[PDB]
Amino acid sequence: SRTVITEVIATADSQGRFLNSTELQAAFGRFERAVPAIEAARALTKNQDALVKGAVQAVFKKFPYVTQPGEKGYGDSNQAKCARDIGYYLRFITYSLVASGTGPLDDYVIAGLREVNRAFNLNPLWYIEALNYIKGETGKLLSGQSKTEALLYIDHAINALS
Amino acid sequence: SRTVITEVIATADSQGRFLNSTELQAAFGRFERAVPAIEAARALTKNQDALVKGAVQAVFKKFPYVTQPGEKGYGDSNQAKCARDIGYYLRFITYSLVASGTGPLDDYVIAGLREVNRAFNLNPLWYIEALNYIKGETGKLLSGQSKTEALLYIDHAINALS
Amino acid sequence: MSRTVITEVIATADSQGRFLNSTELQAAFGRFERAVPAIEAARALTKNQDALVKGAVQAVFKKFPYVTQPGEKGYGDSNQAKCARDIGYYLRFITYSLVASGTGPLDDYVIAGLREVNRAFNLNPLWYIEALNYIKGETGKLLSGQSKTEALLYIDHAINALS
Amino acid sequence: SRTVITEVIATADSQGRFLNSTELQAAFGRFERAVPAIEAARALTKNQDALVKGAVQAVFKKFPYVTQPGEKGYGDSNQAKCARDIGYYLRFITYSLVASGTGPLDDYVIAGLREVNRAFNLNPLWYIEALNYIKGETGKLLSGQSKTEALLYIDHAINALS
Amino acid sequence: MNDVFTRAIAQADLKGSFLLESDLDKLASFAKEGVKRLDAVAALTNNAPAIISDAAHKLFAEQQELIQPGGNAYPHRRMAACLRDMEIILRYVSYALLAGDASVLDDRCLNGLRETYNALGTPTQSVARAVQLMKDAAMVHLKSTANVTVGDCSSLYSEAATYFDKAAASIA
Amino acid sequence: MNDVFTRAIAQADLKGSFLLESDLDKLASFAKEGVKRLDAVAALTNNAPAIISDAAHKLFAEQQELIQPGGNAYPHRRMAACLRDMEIILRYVSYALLAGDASVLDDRCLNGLRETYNALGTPTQSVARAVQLMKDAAMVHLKSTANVTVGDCSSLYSEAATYFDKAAASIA
Amino acid sequence: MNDVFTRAIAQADLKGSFLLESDLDKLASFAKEGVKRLDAVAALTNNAPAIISDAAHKLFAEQQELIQPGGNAYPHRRMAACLRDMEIILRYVSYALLAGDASVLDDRCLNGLRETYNALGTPTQSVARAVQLMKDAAMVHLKSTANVTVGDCSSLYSEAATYFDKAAASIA
Amino acid sequence: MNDVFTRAIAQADLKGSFLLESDLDKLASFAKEGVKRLDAVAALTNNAPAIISDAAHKLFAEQQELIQPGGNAYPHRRMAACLRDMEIILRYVSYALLAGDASVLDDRCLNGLRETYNALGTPTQSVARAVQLMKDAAMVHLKSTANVTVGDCSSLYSEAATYFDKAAASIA
Amino acid sequence: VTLRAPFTEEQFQGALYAIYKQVFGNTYVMESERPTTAESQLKDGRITVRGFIRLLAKTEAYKSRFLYTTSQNRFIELNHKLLLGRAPYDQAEIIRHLDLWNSQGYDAEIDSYIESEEYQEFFGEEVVPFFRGFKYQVGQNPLGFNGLVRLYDGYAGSDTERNQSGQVARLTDRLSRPVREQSSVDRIERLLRSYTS
Ligand SMILES: CCC1=C(C)/C(=C/C2=NC(=C\c3[nH]c(/C=C4\NC(=O)[C@H](C)[C@H]4CC)c(C)c3CCC(=O)O)/C(CCC(=O)O)=C2C)NC1=O
Ligand SMILES: CCC1=C(C)/C(=C/C2=NC(=C\c3[nH]c(/C=C4\NC(=O)[C@H](C)[C@H]4CC)c(C)c3CCC(=O)O)/C(CCC(=O)O)=C2C)NC1=O
Ligand SMILES: CCC1=C(C)/C(=C/C2=NC(=C\c3[nH]c(/C=C4\NC(=O)[C@H](C)[C@H]4CC)c(C)c3CCC(=O)O)/C(CCC(=O)O)=C2C)NC1=O
Ligand SMILES: CCC1=C(C)/C(=C/C2=NC(=C\c3[nH]c(/C=C4\NC(=O)[C@H](C)[C@H]4CC)c(C)c3CCC(=O)O)/C(CCC(=O)O)=C2C)NC1=O
Ligand SMILES: CCC1=C(C)/C(=C/C2=NC(=C\c3[nH]c(/C=C4\NC(=O)[C@H](C)[C@H]4CC)c(C)c3CCC(=O)O)/C(CCC(=O)O)=C2C)NC1=O
Ligand SMILES: CCC1=C(C)/C(=C/C2=NC(=C\c3[nH]c(/C=C4\NC(=O)[C@H](C)[C@H]4CC)c(C)c3CCC(=O)O)/C(CCC(=O)O)=C2C)NC1=O
Ligand SMILES: CCC1=C(C)/C(=C/C2=NC(=C\c3[nH]c(/C=C4\NC(=O)[C@H](C)[C@H]4CC)c(C)c3CCC(=O)O)/C(CCC(=O)O)=C2C)NC1=O
Ligand SMILES: CCC1=C(C)/C(=C/C2=NC(=C\c3[nH]c(/C=C4\NC(=O)[C@H](C)[C@H]4CC)c(C)c3CCC(=O)O)/C(CCC(=O)O)=C2C)NC1=O
Ligand SMILES: CCC1=C(C)/C(=C/C2=NC(=C\c3[nH]c(/C=C4\NC(=O)[C@H](C)[C@H]4CC)c(C)c3CCC(=O)O)/C(CCC(=O)O)=C2C)NC1=O
Ligand SMILES: CCC1=C(C)/C(=C/C2=NC(=C\c3[nH]c(/C=C4\NC(=O)[C@H](C)[C@H]4CC)c(C)c3CCC(=O)O)/C(CCC(=O)O)=C2C)NC1=O
Ligand SMILES: CCC1=C(C)/C(=C/C2=NC(=C\c3[nH]c(/C=C4\NC(=O)[C@H](C)[C@H]4CC)c(C)c3CCC(=O)O)/C(CCC(=O)O)=C2C)NC1=O
16 A cells, blocks of 8 residues: 555655655654544444444435436445445545555545446445535544544545545 | 655655645644754754864864875865865754755755765765764754754764765 | 677677678777787786785885774784785786776776775775876886886776776 | 495394304405405596586486476576585495495485485486496496496495386 | 555455454554654664675675685675675665565565576575674664663564564575 | 687686686787688678578578468568578677677577577578578688688688587577 | 458468459458448447446346455456456457457457466456356347348357357456 | 363363363364364375475575585485474474364473484584474465465464474474 | 647547556556646647656556566566567666666666667657567567567566566566576586585
8 A cells, every 4th residue: 555654665665765864754753643543543433334324314315316216326235335335435534544544545445436436327426425424423523633634534535536 | 955845745746636645744744843953953053163163173083194294184274174064064954954854955965975075085984973973962962852853864964975 | 798899899780780890890900909918918917916916015004004003904914915815806807908908807897886895895995096006106117118008008997997 | 334244243243153154254255356346436436527427417418308497407506416416326336335335325325215305306217317327437437347346336226216 | 565554454455344443452552662663763774884884794704705706796796786785685674674564575675586596696595694694783783772762672673583584584 | 798808807717817828828819810800700791691692592492391382481571581580690600700709699699599489480490501501601702712811711710610500509 | 460351361372372262252242241240340339338337237246256355346446447358358359340350359359368367366257257248238239220221130140249259268 | 192171171170170161162262263273284284295395495505514414414314314303393283283282292292302312413403493494384385275265363373383482492 | 659749639548548558568557547747748748758658657656566566677677678668688787777776766767768779769759669579679689589578478468566476577587597607617516515515
């Protein structure tokens, strides 16, 4: 992937040198911010189910036309698959929080996002809506530093989808 | 020049994308490191007059044969150049310190240094040991984080001379 | 992959995919007819193992007396012994470059990666420069004519690389 | 070790008598054949290097397919090892000649060869044609009873390798 | 190219689950004591010339055939290759130390280096002994407690030792 | 690559010795017959199209099989390839002639050729016979006595025959 | 990379002969049936996204294990790779349908495909299954009587089926 | 000998009480993981000759001073003894793994071998690197899930690690 | 695949497809990775195809696929095969590029390819690189053709990081021996005296 540590190592490797002071200071800043990030990861880990469902019904509520038969929303397997997708994004946001880098998102969701979205006629707007719900919910769930730390990856994913 | 902010803007610009989490938060870490480095710059600024004489005398005593007549160290003009040049190094040390990166130091000393030393027949060991003396002196002038940041910069400089 | 006049001319003709035309025959013939003074100087130096190596180490000690005292590189009997070995290496590669009538052996055997090996064992180039200046002095008298010209030209090339 | 004198001395010790005609007669035979065998071994030492290197080449002329890059026979240290091993084989043959007993072969190489070959996949047939090469040369390089006994010992060496 | 965090995320994706609480706890511990690791990596970085010089000195002392004529480090070019190779090995040792992961070492450097040294007839034992001399000098320079606050680092010492052992074992 | 001077330097160095007086004797000899060697190399350079065309005529005389439809040198795009291969091998033979060793011929030309031709499906015996025919058609231009001083040069014809033989044995 | 015309030309030139009047008749019939061939190629081309999506849906319905963790087609990158592979395969079968000969497949599509999959670990039976689903989806679109005149194209349907079988057999 | 269950019963007799429920809990855990244990021991048995062979390769490459004359492996009977020694020590540590209790290792393997080797002149340190190369070779096959369902055996992996650690510290 | 500067909208995508197929190999490159600013700059000719290929070489996708997961040998071979079209001929190239990278950075290592005279002659500023070692290119070894055959295993295949080989070096063993085994004949008996000691 590409964390802070991993990006520092890549920069000091391609350039074929050692790690100087600035790269070590970047690593130090990462080590500092790790603990708020791990706290946020714990918090979002505990409330996985509530976030996933609340986002699911939020998305169905924003575009009510999706639900009725003859389109994507209808079908029990389809809604279970909606839940699976929203859980996927939530898990990868937690992963980015743990690693303190946008690596896992770029690796697992963003790389290939547009082509898979267009191939299956999926819509980003649904996922921006769900990510907005998770944004709002984590707004009250979290507070302080871990708050903005999680919000940053949430709206990074929203920017990627938008 | 090069700062942490410079690599932020570059590695956000080469990829052709807006600033994501990692580079903003690395800038944040630079911002914590900024002001204590500024007081360290104050400390090394108040003692430049002592340090230039300490470094030139260090050059004189650790190498006796350079000081004898007919060599690089003998000569009033030569020693005035020694003092001026060590003042130049120490001012670049202050510049790099306030910059939170070796950038000004890098592009005023390091980049292609060795052929410059080689053209005039100027040894780098002289400046390695002089900067070692400055290491020892700033070790007692500063303690804790300021001592660490000054020592790392002088170490980067001596590595450049090495 | 030593580089001597025949070798550069064959390389440049191979790169262009052409036979050897008149210009590299010019170089080859001139180089062959120049071989004789080169081999004469090479054998002259070859006889002179001991005089040159010993004079070079003594001249190094004379020019860098502070090295001799303990606590420095020069201290230690086997140390100066294998310093004499280094000087023998340099002389041998000078003779090799004479014989080949090209800087191929000197380059590929000493000059390639010379700064790194000097710095990483902390060897002072001026040591070897002063030794080669002594060798200048010795070949000023031992040789004569074109052979002297070739030997000094090669030794100044080696100095230029070290210095 | 093992050699006619030593089997005699053991079977007189562990049996608990003093020696009589048969064993001392065998000793007579051994002490008289010494000169043929001993000069034969002298000649083997006198011509050994051709034997070993031409044995390597003989193996390859019979086994070129084992030599190509990517299989066992390929390799420089491998080659040095090949010559080394066949050197010991010739060497122990010489010892056998000197001892006038099959002992040294038994004690050193015939003791446990099979399983070390199975461990290292070393085909004995290789060593077999190497020794066939060897006997081809010793037919000419040696004569009379000496070539007879040398051929006998190397034949038993093959029988071990067989 | 992975650190311990990316390894943990890799196992989590292999299972398909969130990171379990034990994993998160040990990762938080890693991050908390990571300021040990940063300082150890810095010690390696600023001492590396000394380790390289010392490994060279003792190595050519034990095996002077490497500097004998025809020895496989005789000309200045193969001396430079020797020193550059030891320097590179130390670089990826420090990279593994900072990352807490032996993935960068093994993949980026140690995947074909045995075959590289075999193809050139280089005695891999000399390279392995050079790596061991580097680990010994690195430990000597890691005991340095100057300019720093004193504490325990036995975890880091074991990590550096096992990284150097990984190098010297993958080579030969 | 290694001509005879750098070759002798190599065997002198790998055994850690200077160049023995006898070695200097042989190599100064080589130098003095250098002008005869230059004449031979010029003979090979200037008569190159004639040697190639004569070898081609003979080779497609015995084996018309190549130039029939379905034969290797048929499609008129493979005939130019045949002629260019002949040019390349002749050029490398003249290179090895001027240098004095087959190092040029065995390095830049021969190490990977038999399997190249196996990959392309080209018969290698025909290429070997082309090189032998080139040796024949090139000795006669090499022995030409016109417009050059007269002297014994059997060493150079022996040597050029060895180089052509070595190229043919490599490809065959 | 040979169409049917160039294939007949090549097996003519092997015989060193002119094209027989029978081969002329065959290629004239092919050129006459080229209108049907073009309509089949167009039906495949226009309905490329529909066919690829339909085959993907059927493949991920009958086989789920690809998309759960540890499966071949998990992340967005691997789903994109799967769809890209299927699109390429359909594209090459359309190419072969126009050419009339399977040369383009073995030359470009399947030249190093099975080796690629056995390298990356992709289940090759799954790729064959996807190709079979594209066969089923594509025959439906080819048989679309709408917007074109009516005529017997069963030969073209069989030919396209054989192309899909060839790709499936090569991949598996 | 005394297996893990035998040790539990023996300590129960030493305290003269019944089993606790927690005792049955650990014992049931061992019973349920016995399947993974059997997979591990099969991994040992299948590759055992291969493992001992390549481990010996790394050992003798690592230590060349023994196969050469004057070494207690030179006379090539000592080949047989040495190979049998690795075979039997891996066999006993496999016994310990299968039983899950290193007691049988202690008794049948390492009661008194130290005096054995010292009175035989064998330098046990060599044997210590021998067994650690044994673990280095074996752990690869242990991680090999070829033809077996994948899963976590980190408990078993660490158990084998401490087994060979016992062997090392023992023979050392 | 040339790009005459007054070119129109169509086949700009064609040139891009050719470039992303050549530089990266047949490895897929998701348009999450396409540098859009570089393509825009190339559109009006602010940079040539040579400058654009320089950029794509110096992106993080090219590094991710080729540098990080591979040793330096495989990296040198891949640079040659992708930005030049030919396998390396001799160990001198590998040594030169390895030391150049080690001393001056990936930036200078790539600039050694892009602004070399071979690139100027064979492709120039405005021709997309292509594999050319299959034909006899002037002044090559027979190992150049063999190497390009070895690296290019199939049209469908590619040089993919995401593989169980680990993207190992295909050719350094092939390329290694010829230059550095003429001294094997003596290293033999040196090893013999080492062993028999
Ligand atoms: C990185 C992990 C990952 C993701 C994120 C991913 C996206 C993804 N979502 C899919 C299905 C789907 N997902 C949805 C979601 C919609 N349903 C309702 O309409 C809502 C408005 C909305 C939910 C917010 C739907 C309708 C499908 C079915 C698409 C189809 O079959 O045509 C599919 C196709 C089959 C499948 O994989 O299950 C993919 C590839 N794939 C992955 O491997
Ligand atoms: C902008 C930053 C800057 C730096 C870094 C700098 C170093 C510097 N010192 C120089 C000359 C010199 N530097 C020295 C001092 C050395 N020789 C001995 O006396 C001492 C052992 C030793 C001092 C530690 C001397 C003597 C010269 C005169 C040239 C000579 O004697 O060879 C020169 C050549 C041109 C000149 O300044 O006159 C440079 C560039 N100058 C700068 O303007
Ligand atoms: C004195 C009694 C004696 C015996 C019996 C003996 C057998 C023997 N063969 C060995 C290697 C070997 N020996 C061979 C066989 C030779 N190489 C092959 O190329 C040829 C076919 C063949 C020669 C014609 C092989 C293939 C190896 C394995 C080399 C390795 O993998 O390291 C080794 C040491 C493992 C090593 O360091 O490579 C021994 C002990 N050594 C002895 O000192
Ligand atoms: C083929 C060409 C070639 C040469 C010539 C060469 C020289 C050379 N210089 C070395 C370092 C050295 N060189 C010297 C020589 C110095 N001692 C002083 O008395 C003198 C002023 C001066 C020489 C006249 C010394 C003492 C060392 C040891 C430095 C150290 O080990 O820290 C070494 C390492 C040998 C060892 O550690 O014992 C070599 C081989 N290397 C090569 O590959
Ligand atoms: C960037 C990551 C990387 C590195 C650094 C690497 C090392 C490496 N060392 C090499 C040669 C070499 N390696 C060495 C060093 C060894 N030989 C002696 O035994 C020394 C004692 C010993 C040092 C410990 C030497 C001397 C050469 C030169 C051999 C020759 O030129 O023929 C080569 C082949 C050509 C060259 O670079 O000179 C590589 C690729 N491989 C990689 O993938
Ligand atoms: C700018 C780059 C950088 C440097 C130079 C650096 C060194 C460094 N190490 C620190 C903590 C520390 N570092 C060490 C380790 C040291 N003491 C032991 O004796 C070891 C021998 C030795 C190095 C391995 C210890 C013991 C502490 C304090 C305990 C702790 O952090 O929990 C601290 C913070 C001091 C504090 O927490 O009050 C710094 C700045 N960190 C960085 O990000
Ligand atoms: C620098 C050293 C070097 C050599 C010598 C060399 C030979 C060489 N000859 C080739 C083609 C060829 N070579 C031949 C010639 C053979 N066919 C007939 O049997 C003739 C008797 C015989 C000529 C003596 C033919 C017909 C081809 C074309 C093969 C094809 O295109 O299918 C090729 C394949 C590249 C191409 O298509 O042009 C090589 C690499 N390559 C090198 O890099
Ligand atoms: C620009 C390239 C160049 C060429 C071509 C050249 C030819 C050349 N050949 C010479 C003598 C000679 N040339 C030849 C060669 C011929 N004699 C044999 O019978 C063969 C027919 C044939 C050689 C196979 C010989 C044998 C000598 C006598 C040299 C001696 O006495 O050793 C000489 C010295 C006197 C003279 O004729 O001017 C020259 C300059 N010199 C050059 O600088
Ligand atoms: C000649 C034209 C051409 C072909 C034919 C081609 C096939 C191809 N597919 C690839 C990746 C892939 N292809 C698939 C497709 C599979 N996914 C499911 O299993 C499906 C059953 C199946 C699709 C039918 C997957 C999952 C990957 C990524 C596998 C990995 O990287 O681990 C790759 C590796 C390139 C990369 O690094 O992304 C190639 C070369 N590439 C080409 O340029
Ligand atoms: C834009 C480029 C273009 C194309 C590709 C094209 C195809 C094409 N289709 C045609 C009609 C036709 N099209 C078809 C094919 C159909 N028969 C059905 O069974 C199938 C559903 C289907 C094929 C699978 C047939 C059989 C004809 C009658 C022409 C004939 O029999 O030769 C004709 C001749 C007009 C006619 O006779 O009515 C052409 C040229 N025309 C164009 O201008
Ligand atoms: C003849 C004696 C015997 C053996 C050898 C045996 C192996 C065995 N292991 C099984 C399950 C398993 N086997 C393993 C162990 C393997 N997977 C892990 O990744 C490791 C790499 C490795 C162990 C080192 C695991 C993890 C399971 C899954 C069962 C579970 O959920 O715990 C199964 C049930 C399903 C199947 O047929 O594969 C068998 C039969 N069973 C026996 O009666």
